[PDB]
Nucleic acid binder design. Structure first.
Ligand code: NA
Length: 211
RNA sequence: GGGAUGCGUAGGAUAGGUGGGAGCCUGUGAACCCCCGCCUCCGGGUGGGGGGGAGGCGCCGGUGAAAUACCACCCUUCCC
């Protein structure tokens, strides 16, 4: 059965039965061919009501920007010298941001470590930039990545199940819209083949993405 | 359509992809034992039955490109 977003938002209350505050997910089977590089969906979006989770942000910057990342609220901040701390297996954070001037050292020394974990700072994921305080403030306000897997599916967290239905409904549209804004011009056919709403431990519920 | 299947090497060992995840399961019967179906890369995996009677599993750690439970969306090959 196909539910509306407003319907699905309200059902999270009932789907969420684990003994913790479950994250609310959105999944979509995408209308692309993920083989071809030009059909890749990748980008970020500021959820209008936040993730509702605290995100330990590390910032590796240079010069004044180290002060900027500090004041933007990044949990740990340092120069190229915290590379050697991750080289020793520190790795206690959720997201790495970085200014372009350090990405030469960061890439070559931590690419092989941060890369496979989707933690490498990357322009395409909104994690590299001299606007490093806006990146941190955008993350801390609940910006999320989304990047199709090779199977052509795509997934994103869009809230906690403790949120009011109407706020979850908002976050779901916002992410749905941001998907459609990254619909590759080469992608033929229906873009959002299917779209489901679920919680971490809970069952799925297919939704009407234009509702 | 229905049913399964998912193992280079390193690693408890059979890690399809990715996202979520700090919890999941269990007297409405856990580990463990036996019997049978199927699958098998011959390591094992998996379904069912009987016994059993309170503990399994994850997180952590280590290994690894990636980490284990659990959940979701997909993908694969196979049988009917
Ligand atoms: Na683990």
């Amino acid at each position: 059965k196909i539910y509306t977003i407003d319907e699905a938002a309200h059902l999270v209350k009932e789907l969420a039965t684990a003994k913790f505050d479950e994250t609310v997910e959105v999944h979509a089977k995408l209308g692309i061919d993920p083989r071809r590089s030009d059909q890749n969906v990748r980008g970020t979006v500021s959820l209008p009501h936040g993730l509702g989770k605290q995100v330990r942000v590390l910032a590796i910057a240079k010069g004044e920007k180290i002060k900027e990342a500090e004041e933007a609220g990044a949990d740990y901040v340092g120069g190229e010298e915290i590379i050697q701390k991750i080289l020793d297996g520190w790795m206690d954070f959720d997201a790495v941001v970085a200014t372009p001037d350090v990405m030469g050292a960061v890439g070559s020394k931590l690419g092989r470590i941060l890369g496979p974990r989707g933690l490498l700072p990357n322009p395409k994921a909104g994690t590299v930039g001299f606007n490093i305080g806006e990146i941190i403030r955008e993350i801390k306000a609940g910006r999320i990545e989304f990047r199709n897997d090779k199977t052509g599916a795509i997934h994103a967290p869009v809230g906690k199940a403790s949120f009011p239905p109407e706020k979850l409904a908002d976050n779901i549209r916002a992410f749905i819209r941001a998907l459609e804004a990254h619909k590759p011009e080469g992608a033929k056919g229906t873009f959002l083949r299917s779209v489901y709403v679920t919680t971490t431990m809970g069952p799925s519920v297919r939704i009407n993405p234009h509702s």
